[PDB]
């Protein structure tokens, strides 16, 4: 067979040019041949798919070229391991990054279809809980835009974060069947399935340890392309799916599901550790399959150069088993001596920490590890002993420090501290915001910092300006581009140039106009799909993020009740109208968080129907908060609520989304809020409350909520209302748990920041009364938000941790 | 929005002409855009998929046009309900029916690929057990070729008939993961999902019965196109998949699998009833979803005309619940009076019976029905009472007949006789071969025939000449076409014209040549994938079909042992060399059938390694017999073994496949064998053994196997060898169960036909010694096989049962 003939098999002149005529032809081909429909039976959903497949074609052509480029060049490859990737919708993002939205708009118009309506049909890919998962998605976009040979590796959950329904003011969870109609963006790769082992026992041969009698589960990969901004670079996100191997008869076949349950559902916990076996299986599953893939790719173009061609970033401790697994492969399978394998491992791995809350830290009981992964437990103990021997050498006689730094925690229930394991086996450990990285060094990881100061770094979080500005706020993007060009989209620091228009009346008018249109649009979306009626001239006070005690939605609640009581006291006095919106999901088994949601809706029941309040105050709970809803509400916000107790929010990212979209911020000196105020100037930020040091003082002497109750009349009145059933007539003591918690068991000191919060909120209202000054402060915010672009964050990771150089060089088009 | 614009959305000038240039372009598009591969990483499997998708495009264009045609014309629609559809491979069949194989051959050649190698990569769609499932697939091909508006409705099993492995001579079952790499022929239709109810209770309202508190399982359809032979008609096969509705949290999500287990696996029983709950769920599942689909289609272009636009054919009693379900919908939901609904039901339904063996008859215990389908049990009792009242009127005082005809069977375990239910609610009941249809009237359904003689018919089975001649035996098809043209492919009766070449030396030579090449090819396939070495000059003695006691593979075994003992007795005497091949799967829990497989392999262990036997006798067990293997072995056969006990094989279809492909038949006067000998002339058939009447005589007086053992020395010697461990040295009494069964509990009288069988086999050997005469008899067989084309069978069903006229009119091409 003449091999020269196969040269005809090329992507060389395929999808056609990105002009209207060709797009329509392809749309037509997909509607008929791909979906097997015709114009008579086709529904909007069918048209959405035909368009998605049409855009996919162009995306795929570049995907193939990028992967070919990497094979040829063989650059150092970056593997971002995460158990969460909160992607959201893909159609628009793809059109924008490929510069296809105009042609698609035109092509669909000529066919008698409306593209914006089609886009709203796409399901959100919710394979994440919140900030951690969304950060991974932003990073993927940035790594592609910066031309890095990066791969995101995770799990392809059949069901993502649940859909939230509000029934009788209570949250109800509904499985998120996001794959029901299919996912046009993913490509199954059954030919690349790999085995993953569980259980079994370790037996010692003359030449080494052997893991035998193990149960096998197959890992089948699904590839999703991730496009960079107009550089023709398309990277890969590889998600693993669990499959049972093919080796009474009926029952045996039915029992295959047991193995496939590993990738069935995403654990809905945000910043909380649940030590369940299934979760541990998920963690090893993603790790074992991923590392096999990494080693194979490395061997296809000894291990001394592994760290020069491979960098593995661990997103939190979830994929931490990658350390002992890499050691297992190198020592047991490749037969490298321990010290050499360890050297390679440490130089390859880097770990990112995302929280300081003790209940979020993964500490796995050893009994679960010895039965599920016997060989890894052995390796972990060995790692521990050799690590502790190093500590003893640097601090002779410090037996206390040895107990504190151990990877193994004593107590009746022996547990393995996964964070300690990550620090020991990583060459770099980073926090996600300056204040957080400092706290890591001053507190929880103080011992580790003293031993290896060089390991600790900071990499302040960021968000991608493509989805979080260009995509969700085209109106804002347009007026900014008309003054400074389009270069800021991949170089956000250029927003700085806007400081020159702070006094320009034209700009001031335009910024305020874009915001009003966004607010009008949002109020319309609310009436259409969720029936009620907010006043579009009120101040849009928004707090959207997962429901958590540390995020203090309750503090927000106390303020709106204060506002309501104030109006009732003096009904004929003027007040800046406000629409207070709070949204977010609560983990299913988090009782207090679910009680907080009920309190929010109960407050709205009273306030929203009080005739003397009228249009001056409206409290709305936005149900099913997710990425696509964030894209709608954030651009319509005036005030962003970032009120976590100082020292608890590692960084936050929603805060950056709001800053970039023209909302002013009211918050504590926590996480990235510190750096945002730093960039915009503290006078252009609404800061209040205790600083980290003040929280420490209170803790030393002891927090007594009663003191505040006794000294603040307005606060006392609120608690009295809550206990008397003022917000729950048919069940007077419904909120007894919330009241008791605030009075006697509040770890987040809500009462301690109440007074400063209310006073600060008063200043916000004062400034809103002056549109011109409000808008001028907003411009000072938008103009200094450049530091918070994920392109900056990724550039720092690449240079300071991965040892690779970013690049904006564009690759050639398929043809 | 100008609706005129949408007229651009058409299939009108799409796939391009069916010439080489366009095919290559599309192949290229699919390899890159559909599969996301390139010429560097593509494997043959990838190339196979690219070709399949390319051919699919042309198939889909006609599919859409056919469905449009039916909407316009609104012809009476035929619904073939079956729990099995044994489809086999689809690529080649599609190319042949669309007349694309030459262009595809050329296009692939020019790309440097070999099409025959690509075709061998396709997985068999094994959603069937054997004859019943394969008949449904042949019928689908014929209904399309005859231009009928037909739909096949069944279940999309995740795992079809198991893959059979032989380990140590024993059968081992392995799950058939046929969807592992995907199915390019099916199209998921999540938008057409329908609910199916289970359990619950019946409550009586003032206006009627209501089925409430039921559990819901969703039925999602998957459509597969089925092309007719060159008429551009593409029908639909709709297979249902079970899905759980979206309404601790983790466990709740994991438990969704329980509902999806309904369509997980095909029960591997052939002609045997297993009363398991899951099976019953499967039966109602397919029925409930299908009928909803039928009613919807009917209402979209009152019920008095239902029978004029709808015909429902029940393939065996598996889909029998369609009768009480249709009644439930018409009475409970549409509120028709009972008598009118019943009239409509009977006129709509027709039932096909496939077996007479009592252990194959479905008799469901009422306790299972009252808990799973309470409302259907009520309807069935009502149906029974009104049916029995009719019997009493026609035969006053015949209380015995009333007990015999009842749909309800008394005994401790009350059961519902599904066959009686089908007869009562169908306007037509048919057997599948003349002798079988007669037995139905003379025995098991005698009572029903006396009450309604007009209901009983016969519809002799057939096979499709496309797959069973043109596809699997191109060499034969070609030499036949060179003398009589290509019109026989859709009018098999034309093979008759070949009787004019019985004496032509050229033809005689060609027929014998085609067979030798087929045998050479098969012997090559055997050495390649299954290593051993059969002599291609020996007589190919083949028996392939499911392992069953009634099919009497054991009788075959006795003959080969007789042959072996004969050679050993007189080693230097000449004998016509023979390669005896036996293949077929055994149901997992059928102990005796699994013992028979072991006996076959044990016989081969001895015979195949006996040096004095040499190349004169070889016994081979063909493992994993399935549709694609049948396509390989049948065309290479010389002798077809159809030796079931007279009166047990309803029809048989493998027998017809062998006749059409140049093999002579040795068999009993059973099933369709009677009609085949009738068509070819009994002198051109090797008939032997008891006729149905002789079996009846033996039964009356009593079957005593000992008599034959005592009177036949050669038989006695064989049994002695089996009991002594001659075929199982390390375990002397391994075959004790087989020997005891043959001697004391043989329901199929193997010994009674032994003598005539051996004598008849002697005549076969005699004729084979004379190639010229052997081949001339073969021609007399091939030339008279026309009656056994499924086109004939379907034509008869359409005219005599469905009330629709067949048609060979070709529809216009897409463009
Ligand atoms: C940005 C984002 C988050 C993170 O919000 P924070 O206020 O940092 O906690 C959570 N959920 C979604 C859907 C997001 O878009
Ligand atoms: C034709 C066919 C059958 C039916 O064979 P019989 O000899 O009629 O029992 C069974 N299995 C397969 C795979 C078939 O092709
Ligand atoms: O690092 C991304 C996010 O991770 C976690 O969700 C932290 O709670 C949050 O503060 C941070 O922004
Ligand atoms: O009707 C199709 C087939 O159904 C069953 O398999 C019968 O056993 C067989 O005789 C018949 O040919």
Curated annotation (Swiss-Prot), chains A, B:
Pfam families: Phosphorylase. Its EC number is 2.4.1.1. One of its GO terms (molecular function) is pyridoxal phosphate binding. The modification Phosphoserine is found at residues 10, 406, 490, 723-724. It catalyses: [(1->4)-alpha-D-glucosyl](n) + phosphate = [(1->4)-alpha-D-glucosyl](n-1) + alpha-D-glucose 1-phosphate. The record marks 104, 138 as: Involved in the association of subunits. Its cofactor is pyridoxal 5'-phosphate. The modification Phosphotyrosine is found at residues 199, 222, 449. The record marks 151 as: Can be labeled by an AMP analog. The modification N6-(pyridoxal phosphate)lysine is found at residue 657. Phosphorylation of Ser-10 converts phosphorylase B (unphosphorylated) to phosphorylase A. InterPro entries: Glycg_phsphrylas, Glyco_trans_35, Pyridoxal_P_attach_site. AMP binds at residues 38, 71, 296-301. Keywords: Acetylation, Allosteric enzyme, Carbohydrate metabolism, Glycogen metabolism, Glycosyltransferase, Nucleotide-binding, Phosphoprotein, Pyridoxal phosphate, Transferase. Allosterically regulated through the non-covalent binding of metabolites, being activated by AMP and inhibited by ATP, ADP, and glucose-6-phosphate. The activity is also controlled by post-translational modifications including phosphorylation. Homodimer. Homotetramer; to form the enzymatically active phosphorylase A. Allosteric enzyme that catalyzes the rate-limiting step in glycogen catabolism, the phosphorolytic cleavage of glycogen to produce glucose-1-phosphate, and plays a central role in maintaining cellular and organismal glucose homeostasis. Belongs to the glycogen phosphorylase family. This is Glycogen phosphorylase, muscle form. The gene is PYGM.
């Amino acid at each position: 067979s003449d091999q020269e003939k196969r040269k005809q098999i090329s992507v060389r002149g395929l999808a056609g040019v990105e002009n209207v005529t060709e797009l329509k032809k392809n749309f037509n081909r997909h509607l008929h041949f791909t979906l097997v429909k015709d114009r008579n039976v086709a529904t909007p959903r069918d048209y959405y798919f035909a368009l998605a497949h049409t855009v996919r074609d162009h995306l795929v052509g570049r995907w193939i070229r990028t992967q070919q480029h990497y094979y040829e060049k063989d650059p150092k490859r970056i593997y971002y391991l995460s158990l969460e990737f909160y992607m959201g919708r893909t159609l628009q993002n793809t059109m924008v990054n490929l510069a296809l939205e105009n042609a698609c708009d035109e092509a669909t118009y000529q066919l008698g279809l409306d593209m914006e309506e089609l886009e709203e049909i796409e399901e959100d890919a919710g394979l994440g809980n919140g900030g951690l998962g969304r950060l991974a998605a932003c990073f993927l976009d940035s790594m592609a835009t910066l031309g890095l040979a990066a791969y995101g590796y995770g799990i392809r959950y059949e069901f993502g974060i649940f859909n939230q329904k509000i029934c009788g003011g209570w949250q109800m969870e509904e499985a998120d069947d996001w794959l029901r109609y299919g996912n046009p963006w993913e490509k199954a790769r059954p030919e690349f399935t790999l085995p993953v082992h569980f259980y079994g026992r370790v037996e010692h041969t003359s030449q080494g340890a052997k893991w035998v009698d193990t149960q096998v589960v197959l890992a089948m990969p699904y590839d999703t392309p991730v496009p960079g901004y107009r550089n023709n670079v398309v990277n890969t996100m590889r998600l693993w799916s669990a499959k049972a191997p093919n080796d009474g008869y009926i029952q045996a076949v039915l029992d295959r599901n047991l193995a496939e349950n590993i990738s069935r559902v995403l654990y809905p916990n945000d910043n909380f550790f649940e030590g369940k076996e299934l979760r541990l299986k998920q963690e090893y599953f993603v790790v074992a399959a991923t590392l096999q893939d990494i080693i194979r790719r490395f061997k296809s173009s000894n291990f001394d150069a592994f760290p020069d061609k491979v960098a593995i970033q661990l997103n939190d401790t979830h994929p931490s088993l990658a350390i002992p697994e890499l050691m297992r492969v190198l020592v047991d399978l490749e037969r490298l001596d321990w010290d050499k394998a360890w050297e390679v491992t440490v130089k390859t791995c880097a770990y990112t920490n995302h929280t300081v809350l003790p209940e979020a830290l993964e500490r796995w009981p050893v009994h679960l590890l010895e039965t599920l992964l016997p060989r890894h437990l052995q390796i972990i103990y060995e790692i521990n002993q050799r690590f502790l021997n190093r500590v003893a050498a640097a601090f002779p006689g410090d037996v206390d420090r040895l107990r504190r730094m151990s990877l193994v925690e004593e107590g009746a229930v022996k547990r393995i501290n996964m964070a300690h394991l990550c620090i020991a086996g990583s060459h770099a450990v980073n926090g996600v915001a300056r204040i957080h990285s400092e706290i890591l060094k001053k507190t929880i990881f103080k011992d580790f910092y003293e031993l290896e100061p060089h390991k600790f770094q900071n990499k302040t979080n960021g968000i991608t300006p493509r989805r979080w500005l260009v995509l969700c706020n085209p109106g804002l993007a347009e007026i900014i581009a008309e003054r400074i060009g389009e270069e800021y989209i991949s170089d956000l620091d250029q927003l700085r140039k806007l400081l020159s228009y702070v006094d320009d009346e034209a700009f001031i008018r335009d910024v305020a106009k874009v915001k009003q249109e966004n607010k009008l649009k949002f109020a319309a979306y609310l009436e259409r799909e969720y029936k009620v009626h907010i006043n579009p001239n009120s101040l849009f006070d928004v707090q959207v993020k997962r429901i958590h005690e540390y995020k203090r939605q309750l503090l927000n609640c106390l303020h709106v009740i204060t506002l309501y009581n104030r109006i009732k006291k003096e009904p004929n006095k003027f007040v800046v109208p406000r629409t207070v919106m709070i949204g977010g999901k609560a983990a299913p088994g988090y009782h207090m968080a679910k009680m907080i949601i009920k309190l929010i809706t109960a407050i709205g029941d009273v306030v929203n129907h009080d005739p003397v309040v009228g249009d001056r105050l409206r409290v709305i709970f936005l149900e099913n908060y997710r990425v696509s809803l964030a894209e709608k509400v954030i651009p319509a916000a005036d005030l962003s609520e970032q009120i976590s107790t100082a020292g608890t929010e590692a960084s936050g990212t929603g805060n950056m989304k709001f800053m970039l979209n023209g909302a002013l911020t009211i918050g504590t000196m926590d996480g990235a809020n510190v750096e945002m105020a730093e960039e915009a100037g503290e006078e252009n930020f609404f800061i209040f409350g205790m600083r980290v040091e003040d929280v420490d003082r209170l803790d030393q002497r002891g927090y007594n909520a009663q003191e505040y109750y006794d000294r603040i009349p307005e606060l006392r009145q609120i608690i009295e209302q809550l206990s008397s059933g003022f917000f729950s007539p048919k069940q007077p003591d419904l909120f007894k748990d919330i009241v008791n918690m605030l009075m006697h068991h509040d770890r987040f000191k809500v009462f301690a920041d109440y007074e400063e919060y209310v006073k600060c909120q008063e200043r916000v209202s004062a400034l809103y009364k002056n549109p011109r000054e409000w808008t001028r402060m907003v411009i000072r915010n938008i103009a200094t938000s450049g530091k918070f672009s994920s392109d900056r964050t990724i550039a720092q990771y690449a240079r300071e941790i991965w040892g690779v150089e970013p690049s904006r060089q564009r690759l050639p088009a398929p043809d």
